PDB file of C-alpha atoms in Angstrom:
ATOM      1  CA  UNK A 235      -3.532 -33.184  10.110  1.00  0.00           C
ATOM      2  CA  UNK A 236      -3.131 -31.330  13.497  1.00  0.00           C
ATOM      3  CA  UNK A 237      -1.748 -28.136  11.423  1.00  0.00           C
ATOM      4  CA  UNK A 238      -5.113 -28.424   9.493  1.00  0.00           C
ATOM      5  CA  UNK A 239      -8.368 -27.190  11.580  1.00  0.00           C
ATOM      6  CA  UNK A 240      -9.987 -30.369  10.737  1.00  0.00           C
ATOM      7  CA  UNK A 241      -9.845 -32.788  14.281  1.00  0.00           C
ATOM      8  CA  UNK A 242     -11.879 -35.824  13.515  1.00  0.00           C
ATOM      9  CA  UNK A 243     -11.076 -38.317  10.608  1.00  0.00           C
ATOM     10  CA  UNK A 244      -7.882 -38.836  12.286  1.00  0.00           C
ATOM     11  CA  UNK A 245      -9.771 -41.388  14.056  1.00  0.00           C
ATOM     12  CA  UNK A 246     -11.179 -42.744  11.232  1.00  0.00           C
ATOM     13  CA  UNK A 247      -7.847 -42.699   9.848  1.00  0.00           C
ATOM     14  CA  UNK A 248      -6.707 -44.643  13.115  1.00  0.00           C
ATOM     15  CA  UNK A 249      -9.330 -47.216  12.326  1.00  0.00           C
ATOM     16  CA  UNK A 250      -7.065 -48.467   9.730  1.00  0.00           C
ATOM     17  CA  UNK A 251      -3.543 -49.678  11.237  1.00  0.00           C
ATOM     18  CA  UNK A 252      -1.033 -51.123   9.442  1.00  0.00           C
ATOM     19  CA  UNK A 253       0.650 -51.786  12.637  1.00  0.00           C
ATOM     20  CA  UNK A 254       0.084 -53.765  15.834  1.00  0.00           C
ATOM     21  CA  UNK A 255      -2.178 -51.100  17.526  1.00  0.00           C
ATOM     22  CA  UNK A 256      -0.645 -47.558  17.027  1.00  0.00           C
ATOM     23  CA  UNK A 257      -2.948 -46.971  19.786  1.00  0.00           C
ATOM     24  CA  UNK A 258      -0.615 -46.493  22.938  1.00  0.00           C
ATOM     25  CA  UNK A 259       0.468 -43.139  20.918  1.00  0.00           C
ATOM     26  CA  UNK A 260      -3.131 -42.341  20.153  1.00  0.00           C
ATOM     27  CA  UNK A 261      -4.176 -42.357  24.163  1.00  0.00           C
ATOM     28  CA  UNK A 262      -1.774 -38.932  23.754  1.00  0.00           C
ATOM     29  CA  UNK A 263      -3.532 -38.110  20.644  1.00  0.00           C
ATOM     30  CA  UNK A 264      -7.408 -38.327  22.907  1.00  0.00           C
ATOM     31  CA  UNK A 265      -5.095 -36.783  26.007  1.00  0.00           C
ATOM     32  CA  UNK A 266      -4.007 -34.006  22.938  1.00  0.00           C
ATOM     33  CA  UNK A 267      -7.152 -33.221  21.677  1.00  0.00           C
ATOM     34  CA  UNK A 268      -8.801 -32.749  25.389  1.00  0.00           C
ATOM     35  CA  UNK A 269      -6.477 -30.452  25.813  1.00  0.00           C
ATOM     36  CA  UNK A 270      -6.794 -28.179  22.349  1.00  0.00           C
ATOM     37  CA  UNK A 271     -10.263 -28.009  22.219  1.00  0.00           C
ATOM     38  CA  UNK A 272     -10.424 -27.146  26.057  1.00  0.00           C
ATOM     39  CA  UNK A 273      -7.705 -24.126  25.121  1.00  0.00           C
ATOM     40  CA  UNK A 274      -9.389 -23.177  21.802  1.00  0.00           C
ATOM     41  CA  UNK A 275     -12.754 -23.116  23.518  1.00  0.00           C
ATOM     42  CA  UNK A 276     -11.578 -21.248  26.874  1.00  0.00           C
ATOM     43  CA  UNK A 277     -11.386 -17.908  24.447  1.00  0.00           C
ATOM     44  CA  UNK A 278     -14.102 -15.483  24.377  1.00  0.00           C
ATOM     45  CA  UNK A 279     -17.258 -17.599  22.891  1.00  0.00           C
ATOM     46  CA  UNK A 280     -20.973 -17.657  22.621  1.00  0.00           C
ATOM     47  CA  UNK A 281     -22.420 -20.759  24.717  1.00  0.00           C
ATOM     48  CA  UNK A 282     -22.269 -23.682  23.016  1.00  0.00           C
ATOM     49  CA  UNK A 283     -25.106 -26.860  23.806  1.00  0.00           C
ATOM     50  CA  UNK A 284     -24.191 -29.831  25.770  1.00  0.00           C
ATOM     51  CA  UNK A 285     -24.411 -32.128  23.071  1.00  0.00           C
ATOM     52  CA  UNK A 286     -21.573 -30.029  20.526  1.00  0.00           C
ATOM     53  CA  UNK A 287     -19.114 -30.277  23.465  1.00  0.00           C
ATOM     54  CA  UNK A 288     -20.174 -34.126  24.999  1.00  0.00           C
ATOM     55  CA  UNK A 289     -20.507 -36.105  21.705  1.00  0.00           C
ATOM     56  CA  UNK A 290     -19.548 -33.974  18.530  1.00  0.00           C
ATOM     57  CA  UNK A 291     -15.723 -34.420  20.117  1.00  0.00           C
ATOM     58  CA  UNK A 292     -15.638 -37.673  21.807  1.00  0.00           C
ATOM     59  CA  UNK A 293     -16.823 -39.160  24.792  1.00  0.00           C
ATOM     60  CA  UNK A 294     -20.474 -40.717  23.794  1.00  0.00           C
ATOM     61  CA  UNK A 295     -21.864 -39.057  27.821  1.00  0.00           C
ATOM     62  CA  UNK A 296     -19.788 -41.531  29.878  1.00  0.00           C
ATOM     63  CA  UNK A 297     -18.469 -38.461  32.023  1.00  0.00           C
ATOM     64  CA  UNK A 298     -18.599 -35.366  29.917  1.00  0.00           C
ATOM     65  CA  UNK A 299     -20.953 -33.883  32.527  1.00  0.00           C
ATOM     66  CA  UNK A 300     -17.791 -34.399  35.135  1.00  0.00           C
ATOM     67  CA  UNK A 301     -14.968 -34.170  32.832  1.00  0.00           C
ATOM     68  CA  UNK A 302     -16.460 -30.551  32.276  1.00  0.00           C
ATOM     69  CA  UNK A 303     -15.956 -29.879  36.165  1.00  0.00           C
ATOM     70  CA  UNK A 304     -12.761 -31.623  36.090  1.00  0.00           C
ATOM     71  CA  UNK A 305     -11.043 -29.419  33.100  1.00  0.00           C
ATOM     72  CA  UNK A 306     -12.298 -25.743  33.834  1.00  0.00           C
ATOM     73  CA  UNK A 307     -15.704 -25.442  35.403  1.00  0.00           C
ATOM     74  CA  UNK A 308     -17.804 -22.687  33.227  1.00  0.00           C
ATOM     75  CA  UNK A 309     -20.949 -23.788  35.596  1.00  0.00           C
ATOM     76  CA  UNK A 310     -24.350 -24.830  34.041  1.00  0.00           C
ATOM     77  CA  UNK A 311     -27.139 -23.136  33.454  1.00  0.00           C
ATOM     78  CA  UNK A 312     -29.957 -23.684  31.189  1.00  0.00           C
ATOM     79  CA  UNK A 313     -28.319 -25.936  29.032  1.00  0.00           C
ATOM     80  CA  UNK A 314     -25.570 -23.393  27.718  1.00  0.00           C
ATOM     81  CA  UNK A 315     -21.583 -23.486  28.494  1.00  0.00           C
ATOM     82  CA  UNK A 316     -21.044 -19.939  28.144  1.00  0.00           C
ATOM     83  CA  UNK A 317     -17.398 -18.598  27.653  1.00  0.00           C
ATOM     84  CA  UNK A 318     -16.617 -15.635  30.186  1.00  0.00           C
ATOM     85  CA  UNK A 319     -16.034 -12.395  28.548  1.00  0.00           C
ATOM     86  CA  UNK A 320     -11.659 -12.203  29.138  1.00  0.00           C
ATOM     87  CA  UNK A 321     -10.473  -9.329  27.178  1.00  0.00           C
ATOM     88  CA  UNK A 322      -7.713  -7.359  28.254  1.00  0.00           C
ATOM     89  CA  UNK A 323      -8.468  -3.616  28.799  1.00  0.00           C
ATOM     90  CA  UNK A 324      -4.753  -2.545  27.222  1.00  0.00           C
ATOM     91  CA  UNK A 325      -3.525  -0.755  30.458  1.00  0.00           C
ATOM     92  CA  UNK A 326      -1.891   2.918  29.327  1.00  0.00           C
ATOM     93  CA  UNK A 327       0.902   2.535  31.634  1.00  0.00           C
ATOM     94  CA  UNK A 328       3.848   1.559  28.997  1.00  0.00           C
ATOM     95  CA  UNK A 329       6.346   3.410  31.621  1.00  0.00           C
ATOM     96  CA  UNK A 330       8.336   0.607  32.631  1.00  0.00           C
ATOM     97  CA  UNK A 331       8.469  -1.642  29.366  1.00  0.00           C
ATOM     98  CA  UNK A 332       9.024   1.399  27.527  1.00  0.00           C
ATOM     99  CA  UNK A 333      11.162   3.687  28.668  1.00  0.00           C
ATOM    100  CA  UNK A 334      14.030   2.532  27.235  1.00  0.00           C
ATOM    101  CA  UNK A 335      11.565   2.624  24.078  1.00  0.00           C
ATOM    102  CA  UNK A 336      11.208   6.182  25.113  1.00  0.00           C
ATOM    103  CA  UNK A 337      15.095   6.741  25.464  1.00  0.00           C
ATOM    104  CA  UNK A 338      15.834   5.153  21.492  1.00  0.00           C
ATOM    105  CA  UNK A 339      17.794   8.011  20.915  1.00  0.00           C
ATOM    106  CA  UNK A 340      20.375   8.463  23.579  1.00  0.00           C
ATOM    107  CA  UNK A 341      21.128   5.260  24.958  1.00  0.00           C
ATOM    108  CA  UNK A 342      21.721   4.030  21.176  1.00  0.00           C
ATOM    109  CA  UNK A 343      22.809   7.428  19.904  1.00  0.00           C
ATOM    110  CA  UNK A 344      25.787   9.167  21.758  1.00  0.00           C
ATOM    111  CA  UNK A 345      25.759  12.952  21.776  1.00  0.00           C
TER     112      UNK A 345
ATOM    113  CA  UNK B 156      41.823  41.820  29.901  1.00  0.00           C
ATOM    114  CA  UNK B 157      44.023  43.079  32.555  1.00  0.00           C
ATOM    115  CA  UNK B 158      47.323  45.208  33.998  1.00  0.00           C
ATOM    116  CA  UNK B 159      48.371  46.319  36.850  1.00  0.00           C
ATOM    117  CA  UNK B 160      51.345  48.781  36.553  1.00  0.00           C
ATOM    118  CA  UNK B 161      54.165  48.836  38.764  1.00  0.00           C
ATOM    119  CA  UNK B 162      55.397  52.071  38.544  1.00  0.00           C
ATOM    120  CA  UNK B 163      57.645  51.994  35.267  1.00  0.00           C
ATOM    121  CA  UNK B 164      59.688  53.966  35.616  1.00  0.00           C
ATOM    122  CA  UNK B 165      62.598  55.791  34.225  1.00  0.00           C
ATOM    123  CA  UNK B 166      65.063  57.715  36.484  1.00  0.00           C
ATOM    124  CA  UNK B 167      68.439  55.506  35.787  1.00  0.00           C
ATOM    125  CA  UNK B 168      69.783  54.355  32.262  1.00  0.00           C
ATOM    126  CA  UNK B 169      72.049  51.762  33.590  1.00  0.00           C
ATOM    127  CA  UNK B 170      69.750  50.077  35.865  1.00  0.00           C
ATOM    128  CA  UNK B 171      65.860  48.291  35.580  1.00  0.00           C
ATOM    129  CA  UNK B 172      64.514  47.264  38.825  1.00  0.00           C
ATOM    130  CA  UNK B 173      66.208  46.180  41.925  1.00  0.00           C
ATOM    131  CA  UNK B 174      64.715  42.323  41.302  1.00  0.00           C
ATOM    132  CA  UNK B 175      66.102  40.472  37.997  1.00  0.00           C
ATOM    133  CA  UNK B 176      66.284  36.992  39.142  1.00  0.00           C
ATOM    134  CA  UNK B 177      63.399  34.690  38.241  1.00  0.00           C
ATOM    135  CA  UNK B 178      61.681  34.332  34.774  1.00  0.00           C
ATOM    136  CA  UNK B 179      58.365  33.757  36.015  1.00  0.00           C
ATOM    137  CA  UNK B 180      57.749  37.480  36.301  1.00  0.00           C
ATOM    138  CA  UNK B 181      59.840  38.191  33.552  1.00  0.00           C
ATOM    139  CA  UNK B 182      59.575  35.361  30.532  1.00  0.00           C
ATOM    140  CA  UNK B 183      56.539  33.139  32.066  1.00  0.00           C
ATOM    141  CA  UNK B 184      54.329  35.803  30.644  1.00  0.00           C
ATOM    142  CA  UNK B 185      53.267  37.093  27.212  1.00  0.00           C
ATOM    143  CA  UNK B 186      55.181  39.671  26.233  1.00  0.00           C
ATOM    144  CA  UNK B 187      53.199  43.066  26.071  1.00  0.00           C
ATOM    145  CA  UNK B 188      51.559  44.026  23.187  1.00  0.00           C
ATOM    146  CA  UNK B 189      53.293  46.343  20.267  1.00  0.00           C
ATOM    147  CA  UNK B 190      51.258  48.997  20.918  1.00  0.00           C
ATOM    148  CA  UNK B 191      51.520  48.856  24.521  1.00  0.00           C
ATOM    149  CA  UNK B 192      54.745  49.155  24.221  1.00  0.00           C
ATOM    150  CA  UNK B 193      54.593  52.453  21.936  1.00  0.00           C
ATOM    151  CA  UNK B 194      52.437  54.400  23.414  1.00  0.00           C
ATOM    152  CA  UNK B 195      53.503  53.250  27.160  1.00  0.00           C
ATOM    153  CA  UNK B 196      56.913  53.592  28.867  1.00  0.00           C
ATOM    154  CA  UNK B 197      59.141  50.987  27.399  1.00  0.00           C
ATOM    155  CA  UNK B 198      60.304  49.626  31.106  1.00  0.00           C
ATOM    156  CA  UNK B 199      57.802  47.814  31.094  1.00  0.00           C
ATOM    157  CA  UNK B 200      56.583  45.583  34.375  1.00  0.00           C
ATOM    158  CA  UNK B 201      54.043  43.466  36.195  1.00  0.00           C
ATOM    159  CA  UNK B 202      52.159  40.169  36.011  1.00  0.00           C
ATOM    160  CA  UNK B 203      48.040  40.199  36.486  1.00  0.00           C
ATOM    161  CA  UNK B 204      46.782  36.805  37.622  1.00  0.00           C
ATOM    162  CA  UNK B 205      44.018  35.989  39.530  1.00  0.00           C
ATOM    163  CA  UNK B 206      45.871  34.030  42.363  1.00  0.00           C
ATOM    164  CA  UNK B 207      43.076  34.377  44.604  1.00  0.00           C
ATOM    165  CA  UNK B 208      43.675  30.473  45.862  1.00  0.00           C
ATOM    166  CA  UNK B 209      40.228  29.612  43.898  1.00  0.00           C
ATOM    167  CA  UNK B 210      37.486  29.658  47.069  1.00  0.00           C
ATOM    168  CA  UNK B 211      35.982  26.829  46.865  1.00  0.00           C
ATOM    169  CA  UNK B 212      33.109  28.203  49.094  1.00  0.00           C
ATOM    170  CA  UNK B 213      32.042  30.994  46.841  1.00  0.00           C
ATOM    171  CA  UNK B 214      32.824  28.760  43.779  1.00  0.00           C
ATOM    172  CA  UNK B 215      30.001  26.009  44.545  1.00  0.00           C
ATOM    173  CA  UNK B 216      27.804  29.020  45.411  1.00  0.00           C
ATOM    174  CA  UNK B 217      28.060  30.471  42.344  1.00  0.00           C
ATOM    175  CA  UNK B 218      28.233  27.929  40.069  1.00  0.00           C
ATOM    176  CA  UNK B 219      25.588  27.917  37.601  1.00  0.00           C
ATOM    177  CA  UNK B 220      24.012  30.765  37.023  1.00  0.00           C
ATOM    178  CA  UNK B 221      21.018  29.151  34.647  1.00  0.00           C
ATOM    179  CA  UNK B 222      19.648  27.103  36.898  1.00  0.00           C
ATOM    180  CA  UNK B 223      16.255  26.789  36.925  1.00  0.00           C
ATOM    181  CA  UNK B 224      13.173  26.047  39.006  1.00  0.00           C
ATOM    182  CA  UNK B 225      13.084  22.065  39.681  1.00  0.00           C
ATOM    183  CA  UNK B 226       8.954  22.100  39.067  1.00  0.00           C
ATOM    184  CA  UNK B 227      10.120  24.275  36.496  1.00  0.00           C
ATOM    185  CA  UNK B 228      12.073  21.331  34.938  1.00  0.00           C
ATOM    186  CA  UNK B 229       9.786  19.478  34.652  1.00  0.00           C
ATOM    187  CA  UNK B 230       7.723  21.441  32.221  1.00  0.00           C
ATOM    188  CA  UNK B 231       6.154  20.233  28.964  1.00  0.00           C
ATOM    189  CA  UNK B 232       5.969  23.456  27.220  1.00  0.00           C
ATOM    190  CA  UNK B 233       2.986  23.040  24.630  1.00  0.00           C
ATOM    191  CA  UNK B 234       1.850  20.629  22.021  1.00  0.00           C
ATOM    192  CA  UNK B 235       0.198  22.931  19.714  1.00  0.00           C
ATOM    193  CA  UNK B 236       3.516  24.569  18.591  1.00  0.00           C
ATOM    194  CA  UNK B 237       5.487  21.329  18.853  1.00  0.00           C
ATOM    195  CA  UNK B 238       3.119  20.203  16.106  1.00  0.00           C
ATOM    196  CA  UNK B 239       3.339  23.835  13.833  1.00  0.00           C
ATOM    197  CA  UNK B 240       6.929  23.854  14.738  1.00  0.00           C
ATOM    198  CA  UNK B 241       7.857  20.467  13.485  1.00  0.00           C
ATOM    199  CA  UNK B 242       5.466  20.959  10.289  1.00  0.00           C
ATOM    200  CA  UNK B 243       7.725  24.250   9.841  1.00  0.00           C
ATOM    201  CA  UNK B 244      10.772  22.525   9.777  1.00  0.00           C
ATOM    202  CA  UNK B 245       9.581  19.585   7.174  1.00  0.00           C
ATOM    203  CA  UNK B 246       9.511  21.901   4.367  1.00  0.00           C
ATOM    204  CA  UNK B 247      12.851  23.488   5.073  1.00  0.00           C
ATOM    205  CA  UNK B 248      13.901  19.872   5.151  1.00  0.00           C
ATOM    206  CA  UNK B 249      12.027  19.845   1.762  1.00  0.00           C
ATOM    207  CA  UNK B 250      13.647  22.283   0.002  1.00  0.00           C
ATOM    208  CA  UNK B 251      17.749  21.746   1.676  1.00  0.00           C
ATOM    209  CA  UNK B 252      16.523  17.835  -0.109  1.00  0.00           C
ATOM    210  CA  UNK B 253      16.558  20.012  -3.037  1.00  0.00           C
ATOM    211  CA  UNK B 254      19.868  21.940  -2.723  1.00  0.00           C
ATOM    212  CA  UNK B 255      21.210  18.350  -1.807  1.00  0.00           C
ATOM    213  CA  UNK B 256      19.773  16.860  -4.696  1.00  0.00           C
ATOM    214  CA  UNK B 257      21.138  19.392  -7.439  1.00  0.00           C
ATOM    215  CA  UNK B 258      24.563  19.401  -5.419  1.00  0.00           C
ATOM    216  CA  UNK B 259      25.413  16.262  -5.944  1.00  0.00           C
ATOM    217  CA  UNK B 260      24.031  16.215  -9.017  1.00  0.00           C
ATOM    218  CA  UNK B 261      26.281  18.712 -10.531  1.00  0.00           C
ATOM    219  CA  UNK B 262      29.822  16.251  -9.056  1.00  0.00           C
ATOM    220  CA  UNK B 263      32.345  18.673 -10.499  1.00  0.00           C
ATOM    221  CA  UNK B 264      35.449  17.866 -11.071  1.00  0.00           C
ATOM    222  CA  UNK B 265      36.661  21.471 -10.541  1.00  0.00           C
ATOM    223  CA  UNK B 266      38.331  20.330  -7.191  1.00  0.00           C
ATOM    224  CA  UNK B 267      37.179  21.111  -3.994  1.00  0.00           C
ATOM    225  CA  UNK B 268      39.499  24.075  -3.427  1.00  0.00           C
ATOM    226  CA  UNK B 269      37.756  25.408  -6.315  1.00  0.00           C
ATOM    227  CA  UNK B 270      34.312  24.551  -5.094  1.00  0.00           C
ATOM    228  CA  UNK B 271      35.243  26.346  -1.931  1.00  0.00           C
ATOM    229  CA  UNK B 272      35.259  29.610  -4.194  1.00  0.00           C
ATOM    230  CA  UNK B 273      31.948  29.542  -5.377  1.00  0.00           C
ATOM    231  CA  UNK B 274      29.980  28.322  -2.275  1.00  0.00           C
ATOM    232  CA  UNK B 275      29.555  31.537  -1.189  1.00  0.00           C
ATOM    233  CA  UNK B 276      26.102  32.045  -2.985  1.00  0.00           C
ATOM    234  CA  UNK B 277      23.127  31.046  -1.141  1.00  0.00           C
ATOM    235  CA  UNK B 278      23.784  27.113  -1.634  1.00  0.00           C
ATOM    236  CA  UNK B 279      23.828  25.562   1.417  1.00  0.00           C
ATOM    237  CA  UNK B 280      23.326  21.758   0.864  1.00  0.00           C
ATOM    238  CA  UNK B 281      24.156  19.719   4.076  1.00  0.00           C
ATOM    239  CA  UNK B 282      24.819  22.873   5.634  1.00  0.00           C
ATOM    240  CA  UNK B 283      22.020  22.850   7.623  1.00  0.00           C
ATOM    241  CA  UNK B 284      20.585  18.816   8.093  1.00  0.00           C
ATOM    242  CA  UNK B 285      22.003  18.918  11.751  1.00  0.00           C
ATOM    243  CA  UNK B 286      20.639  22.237  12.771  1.00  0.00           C
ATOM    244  CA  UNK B 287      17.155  21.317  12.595  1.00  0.00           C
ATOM    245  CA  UNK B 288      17.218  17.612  13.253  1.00  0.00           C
ATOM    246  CA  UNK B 289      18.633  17.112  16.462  1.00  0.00           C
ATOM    247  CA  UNK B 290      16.783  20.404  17.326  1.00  0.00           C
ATOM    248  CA  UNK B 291      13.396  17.983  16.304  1.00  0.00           C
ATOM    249  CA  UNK B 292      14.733  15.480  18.013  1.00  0.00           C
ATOM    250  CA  UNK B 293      15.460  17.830  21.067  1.00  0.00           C
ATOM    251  CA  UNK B 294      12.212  18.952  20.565  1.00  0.00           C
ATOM    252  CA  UNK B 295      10.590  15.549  19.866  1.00  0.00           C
ATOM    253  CA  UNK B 296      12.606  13.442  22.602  1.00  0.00           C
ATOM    254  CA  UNK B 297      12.179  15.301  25.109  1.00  0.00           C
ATOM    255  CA  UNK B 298       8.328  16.026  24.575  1.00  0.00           C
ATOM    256  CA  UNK B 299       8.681  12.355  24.854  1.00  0.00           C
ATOM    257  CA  UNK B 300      10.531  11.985  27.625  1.00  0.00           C
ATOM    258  CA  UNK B 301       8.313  14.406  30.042  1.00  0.00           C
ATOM    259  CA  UNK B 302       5.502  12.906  28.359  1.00  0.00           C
ATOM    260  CA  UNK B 303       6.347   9.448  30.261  1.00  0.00           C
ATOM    261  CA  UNK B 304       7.936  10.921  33.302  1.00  0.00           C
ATOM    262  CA  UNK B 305       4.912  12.185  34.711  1.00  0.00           C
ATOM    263  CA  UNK B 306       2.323   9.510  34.147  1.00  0.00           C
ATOM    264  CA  UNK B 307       2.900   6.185  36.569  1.00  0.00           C
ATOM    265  CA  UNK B 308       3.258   8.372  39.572  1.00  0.00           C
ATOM    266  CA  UNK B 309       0.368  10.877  38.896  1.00  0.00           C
ATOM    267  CA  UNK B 310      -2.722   8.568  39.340  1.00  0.00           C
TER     268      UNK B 310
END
């Protein structure tokens, strides 16, 4: 279920247990998912509400409005938690990296 | 080619020279040529060798004697005629494909010595392939090369 893009009835599916709890591995799970939407999110994206990010994932507003600090920052504006832009110019150096790339002929072929 | 006579000479026909008694003047060399020996004096002599004691001081001045400019070694020559150049040489790569193609097509059994008789028509197949390919990659690698080793360093 955490190969599929769907993130949420595995909760529901953890409201069933045919165990004792099968909860001391779900604390990872929460500690898991905190962490993947954080890293899926911190791409380049377009300012989602309060509300998406706060309840939509978990946390029903105990500290979402601190645990927001306390992962990246992204600071608050009017109502919007705007992703910074982040995309890589691709510097036209390739000297270093590739100049053995440039030399594929004689330091593979001798002549 | 060199000599350097040493007077031969003829005055006594029961004597050579007053020295006979080393063979590096005498067998250590090539023996003259027929002709030189017909048309010259058959008492023949001497030993030409350049037994200067190789000075090393003029040697590493001479040296080469292609050198070139070191700005000018780092030259690019042009792109425009790397690109015609290279489009030249595809369709002569083309057509010796060709020549290949029907040569090993025809696999005659006729035995190579006998294939060696009949080459001499304009078939050339794989008698070319290097000739042009390391010359593109000459030209190619090396339009590579000085295209990279003036870049990180300028700006």
């Amino acid at each position: 279920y955490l190969m599929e893009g769907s993130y949420n009835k595995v909760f529901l599916a953890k409201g069933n247990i045919p165990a004792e709890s099968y909860t001391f591995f779900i604390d990872i799970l929460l500690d898991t998912i905190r962490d993947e939407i954080a890293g899926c999110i911190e791409k380049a994206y377009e300012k989602i509400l309060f509300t998406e990010a706060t309840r939509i994932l978990f946390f029903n507003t105990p500290k979402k409005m601190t645990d927001y600090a306390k992962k990246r920052g992204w600071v608050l504006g009017p109502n919007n938690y705007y992703s910074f832009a982040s995309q890589q110019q691709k510097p036209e150096d390739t000297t270093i990296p590739s100049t053995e790339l440039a030399k594929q002929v004689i330091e593979y072929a001798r002549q | 080619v060199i000599d350097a006579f040493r007077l031969i000479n003829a005055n006594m026909m029961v004597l050579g020279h007053e020295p006979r008694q080393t063979t590096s003047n005498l067998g250590h060399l090539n023996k003259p040529s027929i002709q030189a020996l017909i048309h010259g004096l058959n008492r023949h002599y001497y030993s030409i060798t350049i037994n200067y004691r190789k000075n090393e001081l003029e040697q590493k001045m001479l040296l080469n004697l292609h050198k070139k400019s070191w700005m000018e070694g780092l030259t690019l020559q042009d792109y425009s005629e790397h690109c015609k150049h290279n489009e030249s040489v595809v369709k002569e790569m083309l057509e010796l494909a060709k020549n290949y193609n029907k040569a090993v097509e025809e696999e005659d059994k006729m035995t190579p010595e006998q294939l060696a008789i009949k080459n001499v028509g304009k078939q050339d197949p794989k008698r070319h392939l290097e000739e042009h390919v390391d010359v593109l990659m000459t030209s190619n690698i090396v339009q590579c090369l000085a295209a990279m080793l003036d870049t990180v360093v300028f700006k």
